[PDB]
Paper text:
Talin rod domain–containing protein 1 (TLNRD1) shares 22% homology with the talin R7R8 rod domains, and is highly conserved throughout vertebrate evolution, although little is known about its function. Here we show that TLNRD1 is an α-helical protein structurally homologous to talin R7R8. Like talin R7R8, TLNRD1 binds F-actin, but because it forms a novel antiparallel dimer, it also bundles F-actin.
To determine the extent of the structural similarity between TLNRD1 and talin R7R8, we used x-ray crystallography to solve the structures of both full-length TLNRD1 (TLNRD1-FL) and the four-helix domain (TLNRD1-4H). In both the TLNRD1-FL and TLNRD1-4H structures, the four-helix bundle forms an extensive interaction with a four-helix bundle of a second TLNRD1 molecule. Dimerization of TLNRD1 is mediated via an extensive hydrophobic interface on helices α6 and α7, with the two F250 side chains docking into the opposing molecule. As it is a symmetric dimer, the F250’ docks into the equivalent pocket on the other molecule, leading to an antiparallel configuration. The interface is capped at either end by electrostatic interactions between the side chains of E267 and R246’ and vice versa. TLNRD1-4H bound to RIAM with similar affinity (Kd 0.59 µM), confirming the RIAM interaction is mediated by the four-helix domain. Last, no interaction was observed between KANK1 and TLNRD1-4H, confirming the TLNRD1-KANK1 interaction is mediated via the five-helix module. Given the discovery that TLNRD1-4H can bind actin filaments, we tested the ability of TLNRD1-4H to bundle actin, and surprisingly, we found that the four-helix domain alone is an effective actin bundler.
Residue numbers in the entry:
A (entry chain A), B (entry chain A): 148 to 270
Amino acid sequence: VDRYRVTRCRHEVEQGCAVLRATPLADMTPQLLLEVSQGLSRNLKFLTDACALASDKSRDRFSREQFKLGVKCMSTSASALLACVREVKVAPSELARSRCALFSGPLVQAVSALVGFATEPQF
Amino acid sequence: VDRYRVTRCRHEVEQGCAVLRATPLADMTPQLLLEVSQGLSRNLKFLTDACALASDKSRDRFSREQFKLGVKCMSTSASALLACVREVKVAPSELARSRCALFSGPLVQAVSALVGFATEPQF
């Protein structure tokens, strides 16, 4: 895989999660919330695409399965977060905004675990 | 839900993940690795059971979906970790042991997000 660009993905997911923690409820407009979701989905797509290719090289059967489980953990984390984001759009509250921070950790960690695996010194 | 016992679950998952980081490769026997997996699966079952019940109370449709997405994030994190654990059993190496620490974060965070949601001041 390409060390530089999987790292840039991970940086962009952390950046987008940071937007959801940094931005007060008053400034969480439909448009700000949409740019963040689109930036997250963009970076998840690339990372899933970057990992499919790496699965294709490795002869090892554990690796191929770990990419599959790593990507699925990433995609289920993403869905839990994107539902909180949608929800703070249609039902603004300090609590729904807190909920976004709460469901960021799982996504940031799922991405960090996938990218750390992908840059083991044999890809 | 029962604040005391969902918190004890979260503590036990953190404890079991800590065993995989604390224990040198030499001491990671089949039996130690098995007790940790069984303790994790025990605590995930309880937490999934504790959350099904909470889903059953809430009239809110977002909550019901968030429990579903929260549990699924937890169960996909668990699978990614348990494959690394199995793998350090059948292919002991410092790298496979590191991989266990790498795939703990997603599980600890998925559990922390689910338990934090479950103890929002309305359950």
